[PDB]
């Protein structure tokens, strides 16, 4: 298939699928090169006709329609979304420079704790990205370190390429099968903040299993962070986020105002 500069980013013909980078239940993400300018992009192909029914497909296109409208320097940008070759193809901003999962495992391998100054520098950006999504009535639905990308310049980019077989951060609303809400993203955010400081999930176990996990979540049983290295503000914020009741969790604006204030004084 031949190139068409008239169409721009809104046709598959103008892209070269370099490699696969993610695989979901309904989609597959690729690294591709925009043939028009040579700039590399992420290309997501969602199988809305073959893997989905009418309802799921309607909901999916509605979700993408709102997501393509998001514009924040800390949120992976959507360039295009079009139906071609019986799929919904999304042209996304590429962030190959690394992530927070990679950063955590690096400090873990080097047997070092991430300094609180550093924790807030990345965390404030993650809150900024999420404040924007929530303000435009959009849930992330999977906040985990692997989805918090870091560009070479140190800029955070919140994306999505994601006996257990459950989400990364199990929540009370998942155990009760109650459904995901904006306050579900707050639980994840509180867990992620803890993981930055502890170098492990709050409900991680050397020999972790479903029974033990549910017991720990019911009781909100996580080892407290060293007060010698991490401030009472950092520990209080984790504590008010990791709360069983979604309605008692703070909204993102509140988390974001705390991180802005904390970043400002720790730096």
């Amino acid at each position: 298939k031949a190139l068409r500069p008239d169409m721009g980013y809104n046709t598959l013909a103008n892209f070269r699928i370099e490699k696969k980078i993610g695989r979901g239940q309904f989609s597959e993400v690729y690294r591709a090169a925009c043939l028009l300018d040579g700039v590399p992009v992420a290309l997501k192909k969602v199988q809305i006709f073959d893997l989905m029914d009418a309802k799921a497909r309607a909901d999916c296109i509605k979700e993408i329609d709102l997501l393509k409208q998001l514009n924040h320097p800390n949120v992976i940008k959507f360039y295009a979304s079009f139906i071609e070759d019986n799929e919904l193809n999304i042209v996304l901003e590429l962030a190959d420079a690394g992530d927070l999962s990679r950063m955590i495992k690096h400090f873990k391998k080097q047997k070092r704790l991430i300094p609180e100054r550093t924790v807030w520098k990345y965390f404030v950006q993650l809150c900024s990205a999420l404040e924007h999504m929530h303000s435009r009535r959009v849930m992330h639905r999977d906040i985990k370190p692997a989805n918090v990308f870091i560009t070479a310049t140190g800029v955070v980019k919140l994306g999505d390429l994601g006996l257990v077989g459950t989400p990364y951060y199990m929540s009370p609303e998942r155990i009760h099968e109650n459904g995901y809400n904006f306050k579900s993203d707050i639980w994840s955010l509180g867990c992620l903040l803890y993981e930055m400081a502890a170098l492990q999930s709050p409900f991680y176990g050397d020999k972790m299993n479903l029974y033990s996990l549910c017991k720990k979540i019911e009781q909100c049983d996580y080892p407290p962070l060293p007060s010698d290295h991490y401030s009472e503000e950092l520990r209080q914020l984790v504590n008010m986020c990791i709360n069983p009741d979604p309605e008692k969790r703070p909204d993102v604006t509140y988390v974001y105002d705390v991180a802005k204030r904390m970043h400002a004084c720790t730096a």
């Binding site: 070092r112 300094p115 560009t151």
Partner: peptide, 16 residues
């Protein structure tokens, strides 16, 4: 590039 700078420009904190 960020990770090489982050490890070098960070306080050495131990883990028990």
């Amino acid at each position: 590039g960020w990770l090489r700078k982050e490890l070098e420009n960070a306080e050495f904190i131990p883990m028990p």
